[PDB]
From a paper:
Crystals of the RhoA–DH–PH domain complex were obtained in the presence of GDP which allowed the structure to be determined by X-ray diffraction to 2.1 Å (1 Å=0.1 nm) resolution. There was one molecule of a 1:1 RhoA(GDP)–DH–PH complex in the asymmetric unit. Residues 3–181 of RhoA and residues 1972–2340 of AKAP-Lbc (including the DH and PH domains) were resolved in the electron density. Overall, the structure resembles the general domain arrangement seen in previously published complexes between RhoA and other RhoGEFs. The AKAP-Lbc DH domain interacts with the switch I and switch II loops of RhoA, with a buried surface area at the interface of 1319 Å2. The RhoA switch I loop is bound between helices αA and αH of the DH domain. At the N-terminal end of switch I, there is an extensive hydrogen-bonding network with the DH domain where the DH domain Glu2005 binds simultaneously the backbone nitrogen of RhoA Val38 and the side chains of Thr37 and Tyr34, while the DH domain Arg2163 also forms a hydrogen bond with Thr37 as well as the backbone carbonyl of Val35. The Rho switch II loop is bound in a similar pattern to switch I, with polar interactions between each end of the loop and the DH domain, and a hydrophobic packing in the middle. The AKAP-Lbc PH domain made no contacts with RhoA in the crystal structure. The result is that the binding arrangement is quite different in AKAP-Lbc and results in an entirely straight long α-helix (αI) with four turns of this α-helix separating the residues interacting with switch II from the residues interacting with the PH domain.
Residue numbers in the entry:
A (entry chain B): 1970 to 2340
B (entry chain A): 3 to 181
Write the structure that this text describes.
């Protein structure tokens, strides 16, 4: 079995001593890196399978967790198992066809680049983006859910202690498994890059490897961005619930805006600022820029309310909104709703001139994107 | 118990992975050094206290700012690394790494680690750095930085020679046991 063979700490130890002696240093080095990819992929699959076969299965059977509770700890686990089982088997296939003579021990992989380009392009890439985007995007919630269950659910705690006691190693407790999975994807560029630089005179392999290196970075870049989307969604939900059903704001159109309108909006940026009314008093408020609308909220009685400012709409469509600096006031900024017969102007004051400028740029960017 | 989590951070190429590997591995990697580090739970004893010290690498996450901080929650000690052959990697310590680490890990102790100390007296290194009128980081510059960022302490090491490696993790463990 390969699982038994993969106990070998290095390529130089999995092959015969006689066969090792016949190879150049730079060959040994290159095979050592490929073996490491292969063996750490093996380890990763095993980790996923512990999450599924030990933890998930036990939670469902012993604690009567439904499928959907396990998804709060281990989202997309089945799909991850499918992706990496298949990737790993493709690596084994190439290994098997790289054996030397009738030996089933000694192998020498001349070419791995094509296997990598395939796994990290087309539909395989999209699957990786979608799956890691969701898993990493929910990573902190997943761990937080574990911690709350462990701290407060007596049965869950007892269950976890029993698993740690006998079934699985310390390295693979539940949050540790989650972090192992989240960290896997960013291991690939380092490994691929080292294989490339260890590949000295094979242009098609060098070219493939180069390609796979860039492609995996694109996958990671998209995953990282998707995590930013989840940070924004989770943050918007913090605000939405903090707002209480009580508060309402009329928009320039006449449309009444309320707490439930804040979902399912998409948040761009939020932060504390000050509104300046016509009397010139500064009112502490959360600027909440959404993709289509700008909202201002006062924190009163430990809950958010739609801010009041001289009977003006503080729920503002970005459609025909114009953004200007306040002349001779570096921390200030004007918002003019040109889509009315009496365009309402709203003056807002930041913590600094730097923060004032950044608020103007992102609002302008958000307006430009919208139209 | 006693279970502590350790995370290592620092610029790309400063020796984060090599340090974890040479510390963790049962036999020192004389011929092949692995490219990556998965995770590890080291059994280590300092001042008559048995600790299970989990080790985590951030290598690979330096460029991905939403992914990297997923490594931070529940950390009991941070190894914050620069390379002695890279004054540029030292200036990133207060400028990038310190505010990130203190924000994601408030009140978690930091060990400032100067890696690749075998290269301080390396002539090739001295010539390359000298092109930019730079030189290797001096031990005092390291200690002064540790003080300016509020580090629990300063340690120098070489993963190549293993010199100073055991002391880095023994210190880190002491830091982790504090309250
Ligand atoms: N001379 C010397 N080189 C080292 C030492 N530690 C690591 N390196 C090398 O520096 C490079 C980057 O090491 P790595 O651990 O990958 O850095 P990372 O990007 O922080 O993970 C590799 O070529 C290592 O072999 C060291 O202690 N001395």
């Amino acid at each position: 079995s390969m699982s038994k063979q993969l106990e070998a700490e290095s390529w130089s130890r999995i092959i015969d001593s006689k066969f090792l002696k016949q190879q150049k240093k730079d060959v040994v080095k290159r095979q050592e890196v490929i073996y490491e990819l292969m063996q750490t992929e093996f380890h990763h699959v095993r980790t996923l399978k512990i999450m599924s076969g030990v933890y998930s299965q036990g939670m469902m059977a012993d604690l009567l967790f439904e499928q959907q509770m396990v998804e709060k700890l281990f989202p997309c686990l089945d799909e991850l198992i499918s992706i990496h089982s298949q990737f790993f088997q493709r690596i084994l296939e190439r290994k098997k066809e790289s054996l030397v003579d009738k030996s089933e021990k000694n192998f020498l992989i001349k070419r791995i680049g094509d296997v990598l380009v395939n796994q990290f392009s087309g539909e395989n890439a999209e699957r990786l983006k979608k799956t890691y985007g969701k898993f990493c995007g929910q990573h902190n919630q997943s761990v937080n859910y574990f911690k709350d269950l462990y701290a407060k659910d007596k049965r869950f705690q007892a269950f976890v202690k029993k698993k740690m006691s006998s079934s699985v190693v310390r390295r693979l407790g539940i949050p540790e498994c989650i972090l192992l999975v989240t960290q896997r994807i960013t291991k690939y560029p380092v490994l691929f890059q080292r294989i490339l630089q260890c590949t000295k005179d094979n242009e098609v392999e060098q070219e493939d490897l180069a390609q796979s290196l860039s492609l995996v970075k694109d996958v990671i870049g998209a995953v990282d961005s998707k995590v930013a989307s989840y940070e924004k969604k989770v943050r918007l939900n913090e605000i939405y619930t903090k707002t209480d059903s009580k508060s309402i704001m009329r928009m320039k159109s006449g449309q009444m805006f309320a707490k439930e309108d804040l979902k399912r909006k998409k948040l761009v940026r939020d932060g504390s600022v000050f509104l300046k009314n016509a009397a010139g008093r500064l009112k502490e408020v959360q600027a909440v820029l959404l993709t289509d609308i700008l909202v201002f909220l006062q924190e009163k009685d430990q809950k958010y309310i739609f801010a009041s400012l001289d009977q003006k709409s503080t729920v503002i469509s970005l459609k025909k909104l114009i953004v200007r600096e306040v002349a001779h006031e570096e921390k200030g900024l004007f918002l003019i709703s040109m889509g009315m017969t009496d365009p309402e102007m709203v003056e807002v004051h930041a913590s600094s001139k730097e923060e004032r400028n950044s608020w103007i740029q992102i609002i302008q960017d958000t307006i430009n994107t919208l139209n | 118990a006693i279970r502590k989590k350790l995370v290592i951070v620092g610029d790309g190429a400063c020796g984060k992975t090599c340090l974890l590997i040479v510390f963790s591995k049962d036999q020192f990697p004389e011929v092949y050094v692995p490219t990556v580090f998965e995770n590890y739970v080291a059994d280590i004893e300092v001042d008559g206290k048995q600790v299970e010290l989990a080790l985590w690498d951030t290598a690979g996450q330096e460029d991905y700012d939403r992914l990297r901080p997923l490594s931070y929650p529940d950390t009991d000690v941070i190894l914050m690394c620069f390379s002695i052959d890279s004054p540029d990697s030292l200036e990133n310590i207060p400028e990038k790494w310190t505010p990130e680490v203190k924000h994601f890990c408030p009140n978690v102790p930091i060990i400032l680690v100067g890696n690749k100390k075998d290269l301080r007296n390396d002539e090739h290194t001295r010539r390359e750095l000298a092109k930019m009128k730079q030189e290797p980081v001096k031990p005092e510059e390291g200690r002064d930085m540790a003080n300016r960022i509020g580090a629990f302490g300063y340690m120098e090491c070489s993963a190549k020679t293993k010199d100073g490696v055991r002391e880095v993790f023994e210190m880190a463990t002491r830091a982790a046991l504090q309250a």
